[PDB]
Symmetry: D2
Subunit: 252 residues, 4 copies
C-alpha cells in the first residue's frame, strides 16, 4: 500500500521508511531538506525504493501523496524537535510553544488531513513516533517531555473514535534509539563510541544497549501490516527496559 513517513532523515524515519519499503509498500517520504531540489534528488538517487516529497506542510503533503500515489494507507508521524534542558524559569514561553507545535500540533494536523479518506474506505493505520520520556522524566526537560505526553494521549484518544471506522492508532515512544547519523537523538558519535555514554546506556536500560532502527522498523511494519489491529490505542515503550532504578547502597 501507500504510506507516508515524515522527517525520514531523523529519529525513527529511516528504520520506518525502509522496513515499510521492504514490506512492499510505496513509501512517500517527507523531510525539511526536501525543500532543496539538490537534497531531494540526492535522496531519491540513494534510495530508489523511497519516494521523497518536497511538500512541507501537513495538508499540502497528504494531497501530494494522495494524487501522486492514489491514497494514503499508513501514516507514520515521526516527530522531532531540538529541545534545550533548562530550569522552568529559564525557558521562554515561546520555547514551550515551539515544542508543542512540533510535537503535538504537527501530528494532529497530519491526522486532521488524511482522516476523512481513511474513514471513508473504512481502513488505514496511524502511528505516532513520540517518546518514552513521559514514563520516566529527567529534571529540566519539562517542555519536550510534556508535549510528548500530549501526543501519546492524542493517539490513544483517536483510537477511540477511529476504531468504529476500523482504523488503528498507535504511539511508539522510544528512548535510547540509535539515530545513527541523525542528531535526533542518539547519534553514533558519541553514544556508540565515547566510553562515558556507552557506560550510561549500559546502566539505565535493562538490555544494556541502544535500540536499533531495524527494531523500530519491524514494529512499524508489523503494526501497519494489519496483523494485529486489536492493539489499537496502545503506547509502545521502545526503551530496552529503561529506566533501571538505582538500588540500595551495597547492591551490585
Amino acid at each position: 500500500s501507500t504510506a507516508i513517513v515524515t522527517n525520514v532523515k531523523h529519529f525513527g524515519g529511516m528504520g520506518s521508511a525502509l522496513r515499510l519499503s521492504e514490506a512492499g509498500h510505496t513509501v512517500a517520504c517527507h523531510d525539511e531538506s526536501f525543500k532543496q531540489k539538490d537534497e531531494l534528488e540526492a535522496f531519491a538517487e540513494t534510495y530508489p525504493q523511497l519516494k521523497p516529497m518536497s511538500e512541507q506542510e501537513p495538508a499540502e503533503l497528504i494531497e501530494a501523496v494522495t494524487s501522486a500515489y492514489g491514497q494514503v494507507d499508513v501514516l507514520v508521524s515521526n516527530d522531532i524537535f531540538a529541545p534545550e534542558f533548562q530550569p522552568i524559569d529559564k525557558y521562554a514561553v515561546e520555547d514551550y510553544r515551539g515544542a508543542v507545535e512540533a510535537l503535538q500540533i504537527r501530528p494532529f494536523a497530519l491526522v486532521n488531513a488524511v482522516a476523512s479518506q481513511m474513514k471513508k474506505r473504512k481502513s488505514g493505520h496511524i502511528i505516532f513516533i513520540t517518546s518514552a520520556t513521559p514514563f520516566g522524566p529527567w529534571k529540566e526537560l519539562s517542555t519536550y517531555t510534556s508535549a510528548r505526553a500530549g501526543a501519546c494521549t492524542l493517539a490513544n484518544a483517536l483510537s477511540k473514535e477511529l476504531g468504529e471506522y476500523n482504523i488503528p492508532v498507535f504511539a511508539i515512544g522510544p528512548n535510547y534509539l540509535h539515530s545513527e547519523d541523525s542528531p535526533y537523538f542518539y547519534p553514533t558519535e558519541p553514544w556508540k563510541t565515547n566510553p562515558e555514554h556507552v557506560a550510561h546506556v549500559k546502566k539505565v536500560t535493562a538490555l544494556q544497549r541502544l535500540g536499533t532502527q531495524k527494531e523500530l522498523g519491524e514494529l512499524v511494519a508489523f503494526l501497519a501490516s494489519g496483523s494485529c489491529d486489536y492493539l489499537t490505542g496502545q503506547v509502545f515503550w521502545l526503551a530496552g527496559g529503561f529506566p533501571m532504578i538505582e538500588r540500595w547502597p551495597g547492591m551490585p
Copy 2:
C-alpha cells in the same frame, strides 16, 4: 501565606479559593471578567475574604500579587477551555492550538513566572487543575483530552526539578465536578436537575454523583498546607470512581 487562584468563577475556582481562604490564606483571585472594574468590585463585595485582581497576563499577575501581598506561596492554576466534541477531521488545526494554548501554555507561563522567587526562598506549592479525561477518553474530544495530558505530565516533570528547592507540584484531574453556576463544566442545570443527566452521572461514576466544590477545595487546601509534600508529582483523579465499565449482558 499568599495563594493565587485563576479563573476563580469557573471550574475549580470557588472551591479552591473559599477553602484555601477558610484555611487562613490570603487568596488573590484572577478571572477574565475582572478586566471590568464593575465585575471585580461586585465579586470583591460578595467575597470580602477574597482578593480579586484585574491582571490578566501571567507575568503581570504574579508581579501584582507579589507587590500587594509580599509574595506567592501557593499557585493554583485552575485552567479552563470550552471545547467542541468533533471527529478529528471536523476540527480545525486552530481548535487544537487554542486548547493547547489555554490548557498547557497558560499553566506553563504562570509557573515560568513564579518559579524563580519560590526557588530562592526554597518554599512554595504549585497545583494544576487539569482533567481526568486522559484516564478514560471519550471519542471525539481529542484536542481537549490530549491538551490536559500535557498539563498533567508538565506537573509531574516539574515536580522533578523543583523538588530540590522543596517545592511540591501536583495535578488534580477532575471529572463530573459540580461547577454550580459556572458552565465549566458541570453546572447545576441540567446536571443536578435533568433526569437524563442525573441518570448518566449515576451510571458512569462509582459514588454515583457529581463531585462537590468542597471536596476539590479540601484537597487543594490539604496539598498546599505542607501536611503531605512527599506526594509531589502526584496526579490526583477526582472523579468518584469514573469510569465505571459496562458489564456483560445479563448482569445488573
Copy 3:
C-alpha cells in the same frame, strides 16, 4: 527454536501454538486434559505440527521439553482460571488464593524453572498471557482482576533482571478475545451468535468486535522472533480499544 505453550486448548493457547508453529517453532504443548493419554493422542493426531506433552507441573514440564527438544527458548505462560463475579463479602478468602495460585504463582513457578538455562545461554523469550481487566476494572471481579495485575507487574519486574542476560519478558493482557470452543473466556456461543452479547461487544470496544486468535498469535510470534526485543517489559493491551467510555446524554 523450542517453545512451550501452556493450557493450549484454552484462552490464547491455540492462536499462540499455531502461529508460533507456522513461524517454524517446535511447539511443545501443555494442558490439563493431557493427563489422559486418550486426550493427548487425539490432540497430537489433529495437530501433527504441535507436540502435546503430558507433564502438568512446572519443573517436570520444563525438564521434559528440555530433554525431548534440547531446550526451551520461548515460554508462553497462557494462564487461566474460572472466576465467579461476586461482592467482595460473598467471596471466600480461598477464592482469592485459588485465583492467585493459578494466575500468579503458576507463571512465576514456570519462569523460576526455565530461568537458569536461559541466563546461561543468555538467550530466550518469556511471554505471559494475562488480562486487560486491570486497565478497566469491572465491579465484582476483584480476585481475578487483581491477580492478573500481579502477573503483569511480575513480567515487567522480571524484564529488569533478565535483560542483563538478553532475555525479553512481556505481558499480553487480552479482553474480548474469541476463545472459539474454549470457555476461557469468550466462546463462539454466545459471543458471536447471541444478539445481546454481539451488541455488548459492539458497544464496549473501539473496533466493535471480538479479538481473533490470529491477532494474539501474530503478536506472540512477533515478540518471540527477536525482531523487537527492545520492547522488553511492555504490557500489551489486546482489547480492541476497550474500554469505550459512555458519553453525555444526547450524544450518539
Copy 4:
C-alpha cells in the same frame, strides 16, 4: 469513629494510628507482638490513646473490634513482609507464596470480613498501605514487587463496587518512608545516619529525603475524614518524587 490499623508497630502503622487518634478516632491496633500479654500491655501503657488488640487473624480481629467498640468505620491495612532480593531462579516458589499471602491475601481477607457491615450502613473507608515499587521496579525483587501491585489493583477494583454503597477505597504506596525503629523498611539506622544511605536517598527522591510518618498519617486521617471521598480508587505514591532518573553524561 472506630478504626483499625494493622501491624501498627511497623511501616506506616504508628503515623496512621496516632494521627487517626489525634483526629479523635477510637483506634484499635493489631500487631504480631500483641500475642504476648506483656507486649500488648506494654503498648497500651505507652499509648493510652490507642486500643491494642490480641486477635491475629482477619475475621477474629474485625469481630473483636466490632464487639468491643461498636463497629469498624475505617480500615487501614498496613501490610508488611520481609522479602529477600534474589534472581528469579534462586527463589523458591514458596518465597512467592509468602509474599502474596502477606501482601495480597491479608488485605483481601480483612476487607472480606468488614465489608458487609460497611455496605449495610452505607458508610466506611478502606485504605491499603502498599508500596511504590511497582511504579519503579528494582531488579531482583519480583516477589514483593508483583504482590504489591496486586494489592494496588485490589484497592482500585474494590472502589468500583463499594462506591455504590458510598465506601471509598484508596491505596497509599510509599517508598523511602522513615520507619524509625521498625525494620520495615527504612529504619533510622542506617537510612538517617550512614552517609552512603543518606546520599542514595538524596539522589533517588526529588525532595531529597525520606518521607515522615506524620506525612503518611496526615494523608490517612485526611482520607478517612470523609473530606474528599471523590478520590475513591486512587493510588497515592508517597515517594517524594522517586524515582529520579539518571541523566546524560556531563549533566549535574
